[PDB]
Design a protein around this nucleic acid. Structure first.
Ligand SMILES: [Mg+2]
Ligand SMILES: [Mg+2]
Ligand SMILES: [Mg+2]
Ligand SMILES: [Mg+2]
Ligand SMILES: [Mg+2]
Ligand SMILES: [Mg+2]
Ligand SMILES: [Mg+2]
Ligand SMILES: [Mg+2]
Lengths: 131, 58, 262, 141, 185
RNA sequence: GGUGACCACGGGUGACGGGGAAUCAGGGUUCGAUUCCGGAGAGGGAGCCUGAGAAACGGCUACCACAUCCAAGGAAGGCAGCAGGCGCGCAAAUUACCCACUCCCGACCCGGGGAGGUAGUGACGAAAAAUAACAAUACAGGACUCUUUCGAGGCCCUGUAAUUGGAAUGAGUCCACUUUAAAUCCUUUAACGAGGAUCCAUUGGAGGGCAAGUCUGGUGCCAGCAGCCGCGGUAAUUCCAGCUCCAA
């Protein structure tokens, strides 16, 4: 906390997607890679923005520590944040749930439904037995 | 065929077995080059010999 | 193949798109439209590679769906719509508009324009003919056609078109001494003044152009887009004023600019 | 002498490709007879089954028994002779062994004092002969 | 299909003839002089001068007043005088043909830290760099063959994290210190 | 009538064509199955439906060849797609994860994509780069230096063996962060983690070509080495070994 400077560059706000895009280079001198939570709250404090709408991703640490470059998307509203974001970024913060099945069983389910034609009970009951 | 193949592997078997001795581990890489560079270059020989080779078995 | 293709490879993409070999196997593959695939920017690589508005392809899809990207007066929801030469790309939310003009190196350069400038747009008539009922039609270098044109427009000429009406505000006759622009070949993206046109019956005509700096060059007639009434262009020119400088003097241009800013 | 006309290029190219059939290197690789007669079929190595163990007299200045094996390659069924190049690596060979024979090193030509032998065995019973010689790994018992 | 690049080149060329007593002694003199690990990296600097001197020779055979000769010739002059292998006033193509490989080999990071007093021995310099102790400007470098330019020559220093500049003592010193303080107070 | 010694026609091709690759004075000589473009083909032929576009084959019909289940009355096939097997061989990867990127399709911001990406095997190949450095003692050596051999140290450089001997680090264990669709690897970063630092560098050679032994012991034209000259029949500069050197 004694020396954690957060600088940003290439900043631009696009009202197209209702967000301000910027690339941020953190500088921890002798500490480890700073977690995304600490970046999120400090960046929110710099922009006077609420610390639940800021998004940061893709942090690459330079050789030997120190400079670490990431990309930050800040939004004017959380509703817009849910409106236009990749689902994995929303899932990281917990706003979106992706508790699904694996793709293989989904493909087995779909090809099982090909055999059964039209029946409103068995075209959907085709996977009830092979769960 | 004449069949003198019964003598195959005769001298190799006849050789008296002597075990390899225990020596210091040889240096590798840059240390190996450092050792041999210092071996043959940074030294002044007053003794004659017409620059005899590195494996002079005298 | 048994039919038309619908995939374009990244390596097979046009050179002026300035695409990179590593991010993806494929290329935008612009849909069919007013312009050919070799001289058009799909909207995906105008909002993701030029202005960096989108980071990946799904954001430029989302912003096209939000219906702010208005091309040439009409909204376009197609992610790979061919923009083409000197078409207005208006984003009303930012209040800024764009004109797609080749730079001095023959590449579609970002060129912002004023709102009053985007109310009009030039075009090059390609074929003149008369349809049924004695109604003269007039197709242009776009896919557009207009009925009842002024009889004093011939082929390979220029017409000024004001948007939302599709009417000919004025016309430029392709003639000696009128400022033009190269639209293909080696000299693509150069601004000069016509000096001579030689005609070859049954073959491509060749024009000779001398720019402001006295440098002379030549190109085929199909690569000519007259834009200026004699010497004053009817459209705001891109940065660099459309003069091709040799490899020698951009080196000292970068050296002096770096020294001046350093 | 040779023709030097401005339009004698057809004669020059026809004479050159007619005369290229007179050096052994071009003729061997282009006629196709050498390719079909090659026991390896154009391969660097081959696999065969040992039929017999034979000894070959050395050339006149030398005097020894050179240990070789008669090998019938599994593909194209051609019988060859394969030298066994070590002090006691013939004893590693038994009858009916999958041996990986290779050329000797001068393009299907006899080497040294061994007459009429153009191949040497490299592996036997799916294990390297050199590994057996150095004792690195044992026979597959 | 794939989006890979596979654009690669060889950085060294093996000598045409092997086993020459004159040539092997010449290379072994260089290896001892500059602490090189193997002859591959005295071949790569030989190849670097081989391509540089070849390009200069090709440019000099070009016709005078050729824009290609002027632009390309001054282009490689700029990077040659940047890395310091050529004098600032010696901005000519002809004097490039007289360049050697010794003045290239002294542009290495290992030779530069040894020649600047940061290391007492040339072989000590390589082990110091490879152990993440040296730095250039503010970026830590661990490549002995890291070339240096004039604008970076005066910025060579120990890294902040190494036990030669700032703090952060090594683990043998820490274990020895905790040995002393545990056995006596 | 038409084509032909300006090579028709016929035959072969271990021939898909090109952009290109290897070698590099100039000229040239080979290789391009292979990710880009064009063509062709879906076990071999042939014929069609639909459709803008197919003579389509992850469409159909028939024959030929292989092959599947059967209650023997019938029915169903096309991995030169991704994986994975058999076989063929000298010769080549996992019956993995995901549409997050690039793009495509669709009525479509919402679905799908073994295209594709990600990971696994991976010494085809290419780039960088560990296996150690320093100091103090010995015994040497230096233009060494001080008287002009003699003795030493006001200095410099390797080597052999030592409580040296305390400074420095990874290779690994492994906390966390990071990366990522989710992981993995890389980069940071705790804490352990080197004195035969046994945390062990190998592959080929030592007659010449061609760098390096006329060292020692066995063998005795035998066994073997040896690309070529050649070594070997009781004193082997060449075999088989030990030791020592050389090349990378
Ligand atoms: Mg074929
Ligand atoms: Mg091809
Ligand atoms: Mg193809
Ligand atoms: Mg077909
Ligand atoms: Mg249709
Ligand atoms: Mg078919
Ligand atoms: Mg090791
Ligand atoms: Mg020996």
């Amino acid at each position: 906390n004694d020396t954690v400077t957060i600088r940003t560059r290439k900043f631009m706000t696009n009202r197209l997607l209702q967000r301000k895009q910027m690339v941020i280079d953190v500088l921890h001198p002798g500490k480890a890679t700073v977690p995304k939570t600490e970046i999120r709250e400090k960046l929110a404090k710099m922009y006077k923005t609420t610390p639940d709408v800021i998004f940061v991703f893709g942090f690459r640490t330079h050789f030997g520590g120190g400079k670490t470059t990431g990309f930050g998307m800040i939004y004017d509203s959380l509703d817009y944040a849910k409106k236009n974001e990749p689902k994995h970024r929303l899932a990281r913060h917990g706003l979106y749930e992706k508790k699904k099945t694996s793709r293989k069983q989904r493909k087995e389910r779909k090809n099982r439904m090909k055999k059964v034609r039209g029946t409103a009970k068995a075209n959907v009951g085709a996977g009830k037995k092979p769960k | 065929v004449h069949g003198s193949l019964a003598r195959a592997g005769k001298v190799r078997g006849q050789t008296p077995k002597v075990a390899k001795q225990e020596k210091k581990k040889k240096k590798t890489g840059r240390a190996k080059r450092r050792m041999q560079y210092n071996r043959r270059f940074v030294n002044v020989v007053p003794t004659f010999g017409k620059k005899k080779g590195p494996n002079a078995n005298s | 193949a048994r039919g038309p293709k619908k995939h374009l490879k990244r390596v097979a993409a046009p050179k002026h798109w300035m695409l990179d070999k590593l991010t993806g196997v494929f290329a935008p593959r612009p849909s069919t439209g007013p312009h050919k695939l070799r001289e058009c920017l799909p909207l995906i690589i105008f909002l993701r590679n030029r202005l960096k508005y989108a980071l990946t392809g799904d954001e430029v899809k989302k912003i096209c769906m939000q219906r702010f990207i208005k091309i040439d007066g009409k909204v376009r929801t197609d992610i790979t719509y061919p923009a083409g030469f000197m078409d207005v790309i208006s984003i009303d939310k930012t209040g800024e508009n764009f004109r797609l003009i080749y730079d001095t190196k023959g590449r579609f350069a970002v060129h912002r324009i004023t709102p009053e400038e985007a109310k009009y747009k030039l075009c090059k008539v390609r074929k003149i003919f008369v349809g049924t009922k004695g109604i003269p039609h007039l197709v242009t270098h776009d896919a557009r056609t207009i009925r009842y044109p002024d009889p004093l427009i011939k082929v390979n000429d220029t017409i000024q078109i004001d948007l939302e009406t599709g009417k000919i505000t004025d016309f430029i006759k392709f003639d000696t001494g009128n400022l033009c622009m190269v639209t293909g070949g080696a000299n693509l993206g150069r601004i000069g003044v016509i000096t001579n046109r030689e005609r070859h019956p049954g073959s491509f005509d060749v024009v000779h152009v001398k720019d402001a700096n006295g440098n002379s060059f030549a190109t085929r007639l199909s690569n000519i887009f007259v834009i200026g009434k004699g010497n004053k262009p009817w459209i705001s020119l891109p940065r660099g004023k459309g003069i091709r400088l040799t490899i020698a003097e951009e080196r000292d241009k970068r050296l002096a600019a770096k020294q001046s800013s350093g | 002498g040779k023709c030097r006309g401005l339009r004698t290029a057809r004669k020059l190219r026809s004479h050159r490709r007619d005369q290229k059939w007179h050096d052994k290197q071009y003729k061997k690789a282009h006629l196709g007879t050498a390719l079909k007669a090659n026991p390896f079929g154009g391969a660097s190595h081959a696999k065969g089954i040992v039929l017999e163990k034979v000894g070959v007299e050395a050339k006149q200045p030398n005097s020894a028994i050179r240990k070789c094996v008669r090998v019938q390659l599994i593909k194209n069924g051609k019988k060859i002779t394969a030298f066994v190049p070590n002090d006691g690596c013939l004893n590693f060979i038994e009858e009916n062994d999958e041996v990986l024979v290779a050329g000797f090193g001068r393009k299907g030509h006899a080497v040294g004092d061994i007459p009429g032998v153009r191949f040497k065995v490299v592996k036997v019973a799916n294990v390297s002969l050199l590994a057996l010689y150095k004792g690195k790994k044992e026979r597959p018992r | 299909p794939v989006a890979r690049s596979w654009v690669c080149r060889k950085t060294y060329v093996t000598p045409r003839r092997p086993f020459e007593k004159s040539r092997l002694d010449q290379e072994l003199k260089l290896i001892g002089e500059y602490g090189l690990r193997n002859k591959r990296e005295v071949w790569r600097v030989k190849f670097t001068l081989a391509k540089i001197r070849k390009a200069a020779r090709e440019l000099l055979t070009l016709d005078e007043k050729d824009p290609r000769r002027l632009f390309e010739g001054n282009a490689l002059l700029r990077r040659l005088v940047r890395i310091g292998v050529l004098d600032e006033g010696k901005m000519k193509l002809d004097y490039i043909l007289g360049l050697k490989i010794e003045d290239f080999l002294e542009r290495r990071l290992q030779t530069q830290v040894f020649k600047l007093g940061l290391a007492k021995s040339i072989h000590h310099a390589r082990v110091l760099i490879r152990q993440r102790h040296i730095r250039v400007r503010k970026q830590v470098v661990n490549i002995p063959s890291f070339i240096v330019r004039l604008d970076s020559q005066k910025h060579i220093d120990f890294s902040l994290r190494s036990p030669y500049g700032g703090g952060r003592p090594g683990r043998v010193k820490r274990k020895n210190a905790k040995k002393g303080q545990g056995g006596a107070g």
